[PDB]
Structure 1
Amino acid sequence: MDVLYSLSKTLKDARDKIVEGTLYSNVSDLIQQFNQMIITMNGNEFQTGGIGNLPIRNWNFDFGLLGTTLLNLDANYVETARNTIDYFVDFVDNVCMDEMVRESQRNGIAPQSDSLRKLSGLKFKRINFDNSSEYIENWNLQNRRQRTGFTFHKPNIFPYSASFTLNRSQPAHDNLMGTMWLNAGSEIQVAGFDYSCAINAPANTQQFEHIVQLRRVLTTATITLLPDAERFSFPRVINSADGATTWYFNPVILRPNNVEVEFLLNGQIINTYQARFGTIIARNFDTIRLSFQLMRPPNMTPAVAALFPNAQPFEHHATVGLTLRIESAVCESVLADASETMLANVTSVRQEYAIPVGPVFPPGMNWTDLITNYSPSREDNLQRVFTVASIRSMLVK
């Protein structure tokens, strides 16, 4: 594996620093490294493919070095080089792709392909270098057994979940009390509704609560918390819990009362915020708990009083809500987020080559399914597969 990495920063820091002009002395430390490779290779036979729509191309080697020592790089030098790189490019592609489709439960955090199983070989180890690519940096630290770490803008930690829970309901669904929400990606919106506007509730206050359990701990999270759930602020006709009928939701929004957000880790409160809207920091948590209340307005102008009668029918449904968005965070496990193309790269290569569903990943690399049952095997395979996608993107986008 680490092998693989080099093969690239080799080419990038190559197809990039090697252009008509520059002095030799700008690549002395580079040229060398390069050659070293060619040698180790020359002679060894290879094969890639054998699955779905993936060609089976063979690769033979027999190349010379670069002794042409001329102060300044003359055009002629480049072309005689680019022609030798374009075989490694078109190669690596066919290499990444081959080990980017095979999966394994007996452990996938390891080489699978007849291409790579031969790379981890010892005689090839003579190649590694410049591991400043965020992903490899993390691959190593892991295979040595120690704390990892990655960066994400609008991470994708919440499997899609859009539902409701009726805490008080009746057949006619004309006097309900409960919550409805949408957990998806890095965002949570939750609304608490009480058709009776807490008319018979103790202290004329109805308590609500929404708990979300992350499948992985997030640390150093920058979060936006805002009152109101716009998504649940409009009239809706919804299916009943049993699917037998439909109910009507006609919200009128009030400010959430006694808002308390707790970011817990293993049941312990790590961060707690009382009615603080705007930007807040949650430094380490595996659970978010949002508690908020609907308090019947003690003083009401006529127009307001008219919405909340002492007796049914209750036609305007008092609703309070919250919106929470994780802008950025760090996770010790790889995850999809709103900026990185890893998930999309892996998913795209598999789709393009009609790769059959395997034993580890859900059909279509479905994110919701993956994060919902994020087993150790799926994570090890995902990390291997994400790290390869990142190696590939250094050369092929």
Structure 2
Amino acid sequence: EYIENWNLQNRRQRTGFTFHKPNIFPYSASFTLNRSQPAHDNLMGTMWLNAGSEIQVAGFDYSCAINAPANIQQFEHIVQLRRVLTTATITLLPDAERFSFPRVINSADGATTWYFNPVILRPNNVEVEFLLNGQIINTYQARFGTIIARNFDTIRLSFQLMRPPNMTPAVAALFPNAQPFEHHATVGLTLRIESAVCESVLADASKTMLANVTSVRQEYAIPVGPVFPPGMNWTDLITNYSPSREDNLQRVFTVASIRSMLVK
């Protein structure tokens, strides 16, 4: 595959590398508060972990959308990939897990901390849009499970938190009309890119090319060069995936595959 795509590139043609659980998302674990306070007691925002092949996002409102119009609060998460993907098989589920239990987080400036006691609800009016150059390509309304994306450099996950109009006593005793708000309503989404295809080269959970490269460099104590970052950390190497880095990465991955064909 690697040498075939090398030859194709030299004789320019539509290449493709097939990947299983590709590591295209750099590790980013961060929040964003569209309604903040010093005491951090009535908040609205979105938290996200984007790592490897997985995106776990969660929009939290502490007031359960009581003062919002139509008893509804919007949430949108835009992801921009550094390389186009095609024929991607995606597993989309609700109720993100790592942002669905109690938590103590810092503020933006890191000075103080705030608490987050979640109560998981379901996304309503959910809409997943896989776009390409700002134009929309694939759209999915309230479809959960195994879905497809044929060409996309951008993802738009737009969901909503809808206050349950009819509530039992035990749940009505959690979302009051006043500020204390000891239970914070959340709406989550997990999205895993199981398979994918890419014009360019990446890393996976299936192949050892990057491991071979990094191991060689760590073993023989190679100094840092003008292209690759120190230790070849995939985060800093995908966040800036410039053509020179892409070329050198394709080259070293090809020769690493060559070396693995003989000495694994």
Q: How many angstroms apart in 2 are the aligned matches of 1:152 and 1:306? A: 48
* TM-fit CA distance, 1:135: 1.0
Within the candidate set 120, 140, 143, 1:253 is matched to 120
* TM-fit CA distance, 1:147: 1.4
Q: How many angstroms apart in 1 are the aligned matches of 2:205 and 2:135? A: 29
Match of 1:172 in 2: 39
Match of 1:232 in 2: 99
Match of 2:3 in 1: 136
Q: Secondary structure at the match of 1:374?
A: coil
Q: How many angstroms apart in 2 are the aligned matches of 1:244 and 1:299? A: 40
Q: Secondary structure at the match of 1:378?
A: helix
Q: What is the TM-score when the length of structure 1 is the normalising length?
A: 0.66
* TM-fit CA distance, 1:155: 0.4
5+ residue gaps, structure 2, are: none
Q: How many angstroms apart in 2 are the aligned matches of 1:284 and 1:305? A: 44
The number of equivalent residue pairs is: 264
1:41-97 Cα shifts (integer Å, max 9, x gaps): xxxxxxxxxxxxxxxxxxxxxxxxxxxxxxxxxxxxxxxxxxxxxxxxxxxxxxxxx
1:131-159 Cα shifts (integer Å, max 9, x gaps): xxx11111100011221111110001101
Match of 1:328 in 2: 195
Question: Normalized per residue, which structure has more strand?
Answer: 2
Q: How many angstroms apart in 1 are the aligned matches of 2:238 and 2:142? A: 30
Q: How many angstroms apart in 1 are the aligned matches of 2:260 and 2:210? A: 12
Q: Secondary structure at the match of 1:370?
A: helix
Q: How many angstroms apart in 1 are the aligned matches of 2:217 and 2:173? A: 59
* TM-fit CA distance, 1:228: 1.1
Q: How many angstroms apart in 2 are the aligned matches of 1:139 and 1:393? A: 17
Q: Secondary structure at the match of 1:230?
A: coil
Q: How many angstroms apart in 2 are the aligned matches of 1:395 and 1:226? A: 41
1:367-393 Cα shifts (integer Å, max 9, x gaps): 000000000000000000000001111
Within the candidate set 236, 240, 254, 1:369 is matched to 236
Larger Rg: 1
1:212-260 Cα shifts (integer Å, max 9, x gaps): 0000000000000001111100000100111110000000011111110
* TM-fit CA distance, 1:262: 0.4
Q: Secondary structure at the match of 1:349?
A: helix
* TM-fit CA distance, 1:312: 1.4
CA RMSD of aligned residues (A): 0.6
* TM-fit CA distance, 1:350: 0.6
Q: How many angstroms apart in 2 are the aligned matches of 1:334 and 1:221? A: 15
Q: Secondary structure at the match of 2:90?
A: strand
5+ residue gaps, structure 1, are: 1-133
Q: How many angstroms apart in 1 are the aligned matches of 2:2 and 2:179? A: 60
* TM-fit CA distance, 1:281: 0.2
Q: How many angstroms apart in 2 are the aligned matches of 1:145 and 1:277? A: 38
Q: Secondary structure at the match of 1:142?
A: helix
Q: Secondary structure at the match of 2:70?
A: helix
Q: Secondary structure at the match of 2:218?
A: helix
* Deviating more after overlay: 139-148 vs 314-323: 139-148
* TM-fit CA distance, 1:309: 0.5
* TM-fit CA distance, 1:210: 0.4
Q: What is the TM-score when the length of structure 2 is the normalising length?
A: 0.99
Question: Normalized per residue, which structure has more helix?
Answer: 1
Task: State the identity as a percent.
Answer: 99
Q: Secondary structure at the match of 2:98?
A: helix
* TM-fit CA distance, 1:191: 0.3
1:323-378 Cα shifts (integer Å, max 9, x gaps): 00000000010000111111111111111101111111010011000000000000
Q: How many angstroms apart in 2 are the aligned matches of 1:196 and 1:254? A: 13
Higher relative contact order, chain-length normalized (CA < 8 Å, sep 6+): 2
Q: Secondary structure at the match of 2:157?
A: strand
